[PDB]
Amino acid sequence: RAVVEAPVEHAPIGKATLPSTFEDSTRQGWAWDATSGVQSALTIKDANESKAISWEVKYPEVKPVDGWASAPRIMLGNVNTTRGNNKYLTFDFYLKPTQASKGSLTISLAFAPPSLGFWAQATGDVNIPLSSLSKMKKTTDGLYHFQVKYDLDKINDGKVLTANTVLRDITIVVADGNSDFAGTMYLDNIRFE
């Protein structure tokens, strides 16, 4: 299936690049998956003094049965990278809510290794409770700043990502956990470490 809307003005696609820093004002290869529930513009915005890829999202009040149907699902296609000797993939993730008081966001990471059926998903989903936010200190520009880490030795289905396993695509999903989130999201410094 494909989720479609009228043409949208994204920032320039650029070329797939890791670490993804967005400092060339391009998306560095990041784009919505064709199945992403969010298809609105991906632009490059300042976040916490650095250029970051960004989008707006307000989850539906009526929650879909499939937990990813309404989710931003952003993908770096055909990067064809490998983890090397890195234990983690990590990135800076920022929120600027206009509304956030209940439920949570569940952030998942997956890859598409051609040697592993084109899907390998990190086991360590990261949950951010929206009630935690009002107590968290914001950045100078009013964002909540997370640095999200995924242990690449914890992958579902007994699949193992070796140092040399080709990862054709990288996917990040920010799923709605029965939440009332509305506002802007941003990613930066997507990298292995």
Ligand SMILES: OC[C@H]1O[C@@H](O[C@H]2[C@H](O)[C@@H](O)[C@H](O[C@H]3[C@H](O)[C@@H](O)[C@H](O[C@H]4[C@H](O)[C@@H](O)[C@H](O[C@H]5[C@H](O)[C@@H](O)[C@H](O)O[C@@H]5CO)O[C@@H]4CO)O[C@@H]3CO)O[C@@H]2CO)[C@H](O)[C@@H](O)[C@@H]1O
């Ligand atoms: O845990 C957080 C959250 O989970 C929600 O449920 C998720 C579940 O966690 C996911 O595992 C599951 O993921 C599936 C994806 O939705 C689906 O798009 C992906 O499809 C892949 C397929 O696996 C892969 O084999 C296929 O490879 C093709 C290549 O891309 C082509 O290039 C090549 O030519 O052909 C191959 C073979 O077709 O690509 C497709 C597309 O990428 O499969 C995933 C695993 O099944 O999604 C669930 C949501 O639907 C849950 O809902 C939340 O409650 C929970 O918090």
Ligand SMILES: [Ca+2]
């Ligand atoms: Ca940046």
